Ligand binder design. Sequence first.
Ligand SMILES: O=P(O)(O)OC[C@@H](O)CO
Ligand SMILES: [Ca+2]
Ligand SMILES: [Mn+2]
Length: 381
Amino acid sequence: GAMEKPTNYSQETIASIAQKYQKLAEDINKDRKNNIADQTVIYLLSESLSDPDRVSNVTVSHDVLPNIKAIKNSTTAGLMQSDSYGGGTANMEFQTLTSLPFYNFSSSVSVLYSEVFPKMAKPHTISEFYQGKNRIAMHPASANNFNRKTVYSNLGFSKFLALSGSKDKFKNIENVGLLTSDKTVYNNILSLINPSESQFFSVITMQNHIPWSSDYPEEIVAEGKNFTEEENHNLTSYARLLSFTDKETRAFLEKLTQINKPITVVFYGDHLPGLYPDSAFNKHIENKYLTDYFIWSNGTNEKKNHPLINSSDFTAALFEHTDSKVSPYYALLTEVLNKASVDKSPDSPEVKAIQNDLKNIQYDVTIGKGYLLKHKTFFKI
Ligand SMILES: O=P(O)(O)OC[C@@H](O)CO
Ligand SMILES: [Ca+2]
Ligand SMILES: [Mn+2]
């Protein structure tokens, strides 16, 4: 099966969970000031972006993420735990939108968009708080890769910019490396931002996707202990491409500050590039699955303490960072973010209890009975 049924799964257990977090949402909202629908949100999946400084046996001549590191110091930011290495982009993407963690599904599941999403009766995502005409997706490749076209059509999106497979195209396409530049993606985002509307962007870049090729900037060179010439060349090409994304990301956020609209960006690398051998990590193999993330608004920014979170925790962290009122569903996800996520012990009794609540909800909305359809406020603010 796609997911194990909790031992206590039943209509009454779902009822107990709905009521419990209905009241917790009320308490949380007594201190949440804003509404998520008042701000434009941008989920920016930065393909293969991860600071090589965390790879122990790697040496780079220059810091290739100086600007992004400065952004991380100014706002809520830290490390994201990835579920795969060198691939799995769409699986992280699914988790950001639904907030349903991959680690609760079965290992037999390969692509969540193909095996789980189609079986969900009414999938709830962050984009449902926005009007269909204001939901926008972007990816410089085939819209049908990993079944994205079907996902974003079923989610009521009005646009899906893609190099092929959809009516919506990118403008002024330029290549940095072999593939479409992040600059092109960023500028196409800006051209679509409508200050008169609250919008939701789901973006998946391609510039830093394998294969990596770049001869500039020449001064940036990188090597790893006992690497082959090919491995050193791929690392060098990747490090050079990161330096461009770093500068372009800074300029992108700068432009967002000049727009008269509250805008928040959830920026993250989906996984490390598949160019490092396991030896490169030495004493810290955990760094094989730790990418960079930040949650940045175009106005004033708090800095919540979340040094290590999952891709499924982003929405709950978004609501917290923007002090937005939550629904009973996101009240549960706020307890997971703070008390029962990947940074906590899986043997803690509190982590188990909160995870049991999540597993019952997660099972109910995927391949379960759908008891939550009768709890009509569980997903509403
Ligand atoms: O890194 P991967 O898993 O190949 O993702 C690529 C995908 O974004 C192409 O549409
Ligand atoms: Ca508050
Ligand atoms: Mn990827």
